[PDB]
Design a binder for these strands. Structure first.
Lengths: 94, 139, 97, 103, 78, 93, 98, 92
DNA sequence: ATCAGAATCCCGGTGCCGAGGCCGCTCAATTGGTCGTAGACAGCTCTAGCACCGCTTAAACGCACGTACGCGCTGTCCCCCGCGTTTTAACCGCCAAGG
DNA sequence: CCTTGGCGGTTAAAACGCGGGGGACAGCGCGTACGTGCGTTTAAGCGGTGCTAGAGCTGTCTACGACCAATTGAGCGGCCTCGGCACCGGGATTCTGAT
């Protein structure tokens, strides 16, 4: 049973922010559940927005405005900054 | 406890399917079917354990049981040990209509009942099991 | 000797807001769950993780409810929580009509 | 890989496949999964930063659920975001009311 | 089986909730409230299990039933 | 533009239930909002079940168990009976 | 019986519900009796509500149903109010409760 | 003291009409909307829906406040009852 | 205020078992190319939203006045806390009476 | 002599009785803040007319994403070993209530 998770990515992020810190398995499970939850919230908001605006496509505009709707002010601002930065860096190259 | 049993039973299912494929290829390659015999002891030990029946039914291992019971395209029946062990396991577990629908073992059971190379004792047991499984449908 | 009533109470409060271990015994909770479940469908199993999750959720719910009850009791200028406090908290939450 | 092109560590292909197989829209643009992966990576980085701080505060080198609960309930924005979730083995914050304290 | 939730356990839950003094009827009140909560959650979980046709209620059934109520739980495979 | 609403169907149901009663325009707006809301709830829960069980089809079983989840006891019982009766008679016909 | 509503003895539109279920992005496939079942449930629920709304409008000696009577019907029925506890009704007022 | 208040309670519970004046409410809504984007237009039904939601919300809040005030063995609602109600509701 | 003495934090040495790292592989993401349409863009209509102005009058308001209710203080007691004693029921060993 | 069914053990919170203190609750008294009434100012509301931004619609045209197909490496599973931490007894604080 080759079932997917986010454990390795969470571990990589942890070592990127905190090098000398580990994580238990139960906390890795909780972080995976957290990631899945936030994904589900954002995708549901994006879907509802797309259906409101009569569009067949989920683009980065829907994702950005769902982020704005969901997260609080400073958190949403930083997240939008990060997302825009990443999108421009990915688009500038190829 | 029981999530772990489901994972182990799924691993057993994958091993059984792989062994069946390997034995079919070996027969197609001019070699006897040995992998099923090799896996038979572990499958027997797992099936004899009663408390794992619920997990077996939750993983639908009866599909792989039917796959093993399905005669190979060379019109050669499976080894008598495999048939006997699988029949005993089928008797030992509370098979309901939903499980039969998931697995579709009734077709193979009817084939065993109609066939004549099958052992007459297995023929009688197949008739008994088919009657028992038809019992709940009609009342 | 003897402590003032409420000193061991505060010691216990400090001790239990520090730990995270489940405060209900496992077998009684399992028996209660099976007793309740037996009224909807006979011959059900539960996974052990299903009982563990239920116990975690039930204790978290009860602790939040006890916090609201404590808030209500302190609002009424008292220290002892009472059934009317629980009923008021559950009504204000929107749980009892 | 598409994660490398965007300078990311989270997967772009996996997220695109999950958006594709989740019955969300007829088609999915290519700038949505990158943006969403960046947001998720930022949020997990924030969570893990505060949880590592909380675990060092307790002088531990490995994060347990208790430190996640403390990091969540101690950050105003996160605690507002995760307002309805309960964390198994997370406990509660130490909080004793003013009127209950002894005299 | 509802008498298995003893008075000390309710006292412990109230102490972790910061409660200093407890009436005598709080125990029965709490038993009733817990019974109602568990009844609803197990009913939802068994509904899910009936849809799945499984011989066990799984942890997924409980997690989805709590997500249904709004009591999202992390750390059980969600 | 032809806007879609359940107004005529509510008139039909009302005359079936109360032949000598009428509905205001605002009450019809409320009823339309209610019908749309219930449809959205049920379809979303059916989709959630289908995804939970790795299914790509919404059959009457998913709708039935959605009704079981959403409606309370007596309401669920009566609505399930009504739906099964209607589906049975549509199949038979 | 041409329309699918007639073949099921319903008043709600089976075809429109089918179109909305398909052109709504809910699942890859749709059954044949799911629209029928859902239309039956919706019609039953609307009849349930309209009965009590008619009762309330007849208790106020009124021939037309207004938002007030819908509010009364919902907030007076134990099951409907539990279903619709987080719903605001425009011009519905409140229940006399002193 | 306390009879004309009950009469007014009865009167206002018999009715559905909105209690906040419509134009002051419109001006308040525009003033609040002036922060998020300059020079916005509003539908009339938007302002009507906002007023209905606001009055329903406030009536529910006053119900909870009355419950708390009665709990404290009082009849007068005070700001700490509002604060307790918003705390228990989970409001920030 | 001072004190003994219950509770607690603390220190350190000892075990362990789970986190972390590392090999093998397979499947899914990535590259390549092909098509069809969803949506961007422009241009056009005309509704409704803003804007103002005049006139009316019920509502708001400022104010006065009084009392009832909230809050502080006293008293009573009784029922929780803190504590020791007794209990119990999961599962066990040694035992007596009849075949 | 043996199998048979039976009575007495041990044991870890929990069940229980108890003292007694302090807290819930009742009563009382008073002062002010809120309700009630009245005369007065305000602007909401009602109605009217005007102007036009912008929303809703239509038609075009293309780049973007869906789809196949081939390909390879990242991420999975297995499995390994070390040290982070749990546990305990000793040492040392530090609060509690009593004096």
């Amino acid at each position: 049973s080759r079932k997917e998770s986010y454990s390795i990515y969470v571990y990589k992020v942890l070592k990127q922010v905190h090098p000398d810190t580990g994580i238990s398995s139960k906390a890795m499970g909780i972080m995976n559940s957290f990631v899945n939850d936030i994904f589900e919230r954002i995708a549901g908001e994006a879907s509802r927005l797309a259906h409101y605006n009569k569009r067949s496509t989920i683009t980065s505009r829907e994702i950005q405005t769902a982020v704005r709707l969901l997260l609080p002010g400073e958190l949403a601002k930083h997240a939008v900054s990060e997302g825009t930065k990443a999108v421009t860096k990915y688009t500038s190259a190829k | 406890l029981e999530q772990m049993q489901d994972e182990l039973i799924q691993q057993l299912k994958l091993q059984m399917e792989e062994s069946a494929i390997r034995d079919a290829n070996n027969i197609e390659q001019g070699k006897p079917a040995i992998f099923k015999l090799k896996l038979l002891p572990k499958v027997k030990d797992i099936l004899l354990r009663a408390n794992l029946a619920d997990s077996i039914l939750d993983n639908n291992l009866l599909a792989s049981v039917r796959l093993w019971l399905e005669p190979l395209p060379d019109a050669s029946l499976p080894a008598y040990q495999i048939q006997k062990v699988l029949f005993d396991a089928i008797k030992s577990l509370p098979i309901k209509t939903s499980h039969l629908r998931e697995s579709g073992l009734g077709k193979v059971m009817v084939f065993y009942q109609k066939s004549k190379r099958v052992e007459p004792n297995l023929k009688r047991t197949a008739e008994k099991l088919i009657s028992d499984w038809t019992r709940p449908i009609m009342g | 000797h003897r402590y003032r009533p409420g000193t061991v109470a505060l010691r216990e409060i400090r001790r239990y807001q520090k730990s995270t271990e489940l405060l209900i015994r496992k077998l009684p909770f399992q028996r209660l769950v099976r007793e309740i479940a037996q009224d909807f469908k006979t011959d059900l199993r539960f996974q052990s993780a299903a009982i563990g999750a239920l116990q975690e959720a039930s204790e978290a719910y009860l602790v939040g409810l006890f916090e609201d009850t404590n808030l209500c009791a302190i609002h009424a200028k008292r220290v002892t929580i009472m059934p009317k406090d629980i009923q008021l908290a559950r009504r204000i939450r929107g749980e009892r009509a | 890989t598409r994660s490398s092109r965007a300078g990311l560590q989270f997967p772009v292909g996996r997220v695109h496949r999950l958006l594709r197989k989740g019955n969300y829209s007829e088609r999915v643009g290519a700038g949505a999964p990158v943006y969403l992966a960046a947001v998720l990576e930022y949020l997990t980085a924030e969570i893990l930063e505060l949880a590592g701080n909380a675990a060092r505060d307790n002088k531990k080198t490995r994060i347990i659920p208790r430190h996640l609960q403390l990091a969540i309930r101690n950050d105003e924005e996160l605690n507002k975001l995760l307002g309805r979730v309960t964390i198994a083995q997370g406990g509660v914050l130490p909080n004793i009311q003013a009127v209950l304290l002894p005299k | 089986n509802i008498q298995g939730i003893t008075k000390p356990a309710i006292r412990r839950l109230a102490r972790r909730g910061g409660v200093k003094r407890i009436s005598g009827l709080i125990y029965e009140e709490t038993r009733g409230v817990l019974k109602v909560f568990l009844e609803n959650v197990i009913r939802d979980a068994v509904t899910y299990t009936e849809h799945a046709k499984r011989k066990t209620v799984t942890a997924m059934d409980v997690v989805y039933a709590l997500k249904r109520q709004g009591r999202t739980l992390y750390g059980f495979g969600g």
